Design a protein around this ligand. Structure first.
Ligand SMILES: OCCc1ccc(O)cc1
Ligand SMILES: [Cl-]
Ligand SMILES: [Cl-]
Ligand SMILES: [Cl-]
Ligand SMILES: [Zn+2]
Length: 315
């Protein structure tokens, strides 16, 4: 006797595709790799409780390929498996509200994710893939499991792997609309003269070398091809925020002079991130943990600043 149930397959969990499955064969034999809200059911035969449920599958026909790319903006064939594998874990994480922001209770080396998530909620940024748009809206409201799983998938990080905040923000910014952002820099060598540069998009909002937005406006010293030390300063800026990054070092954060910052303790390959936000006082959010202080000194790696338009007076 043949028994069947109706299920739906999906790539985006919005558009559903009716399927009738034979209860005597695995999902894998009928769809290929198949997932139920993160759980890999490829090797499992259908259960009666599965009737009417949605399963994620790979894009094995052109309708699914178009749906998958429209929703995720990626054609990496291993994306689904990485997203499903991460979601199995992030579904179990806790997402407390800390000082009005969605954070992440510490688990599985996820401090860099918590810091990035708290930072996103403090800067003006809209994502381009609907998958991130939708999941970020849910994360803002406190249901951040899908957003965190997607970040891990897009960044090619597995749960438990320690990531870098700057690298993660770089990935997230590539999937955001930063097209209006523009940066003009001037590099002044005493041997080689001037050289001005224009940066756009992600490169117009990120800098590596110094944490101070003010010193960037005054000038920082960098190598030259001739062997001398040349001075680089900010000519013009057009963006809603700027990110200043540098190798971790002792740095003093003063209330009211920045938006938020990433603190990193440890070494290159093993450590812990905390988040400092400047509100009515300085709050340090460490996953679910919250402390406050009037002044801050610590190993800072990233600082975020508000911006709209800046023009130098250094002519
Ligand atoms: O475009 C590939 C990304 C993807 C494919 C299938 C899914 O079910 C989910 C995501
Ligand atoms: Cl968005
Ligand atoms: Cl990383
Ligand atoms: Cl600021
Ligand atoms: Zn030179």
């Amino acid at each position: 006797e043949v028994r069947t149930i109706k299920v739906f397959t999906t790539v985006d969990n919005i558009n559903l595709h009716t399927q009738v499955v034979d209860m005597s064969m695995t999902y894998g034999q009928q769809f290929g790799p198949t997932y139920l809200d993160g759980a890999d059911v490829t090797k499992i035969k259908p259960h009666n409780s599965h009737e009417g449920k949605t399963f994620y599958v790979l894009p094995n026909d052109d309708t699914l390929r178009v749906e998958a790319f429209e929703y995720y903006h990626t054609t990496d064939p291993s994306f689904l498996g990485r997203y499903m594998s991460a979601l199995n874990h992030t579904k179990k994480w806790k997402y407390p509200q800390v000082n009005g922001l969605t954070s992440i209770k510490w688990a599985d080396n996820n401090c860099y994710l918590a810091t990035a998530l708290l930072t996103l909620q403090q800067i003006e940024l809209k994502f381009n893939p609907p998958a991130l748009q939708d999941a970020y809206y849910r994360a803002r409201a406190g249901e951040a499991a899908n957003f965190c799983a997607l970040i891990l998938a897009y960044c090619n990080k597995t749960v438990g792997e320690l990531g870098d905040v700057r690298e993660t923000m770089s990935y997230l910014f590539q999937h955001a609309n930063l097209d209006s952002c523009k940066r003009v820099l001037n590099v002044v060598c005493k041997t080689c003269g001037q050289q001005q540069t224009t940066l756009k998009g992600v490169e117009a909002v990120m800098y590596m070398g110094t944490l101070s937005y003010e010193q960037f406006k005054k000038g920082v010293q960098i190598p030259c091809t001739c062997g001398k030390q040349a001075t680089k300063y900010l000519v013009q800026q057009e963006s809603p925020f700027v990110m200043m990054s540098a190798p971790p070092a002792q740095y003093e954060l003063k209330h009211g002079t920045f938006t938020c910052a990433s603190e990193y303790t440890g070494n290159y390959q093993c450590g812990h991130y905390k988040h400092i936000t400047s509100k009515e006082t300085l709050y340090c959010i460490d996953g679910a943990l919250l402390t406050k202080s009037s002044e801050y000194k610590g190993p800072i790696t990233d600082v975020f600043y508000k911006e709209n338009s800046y023009t130098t007076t250094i002519k």
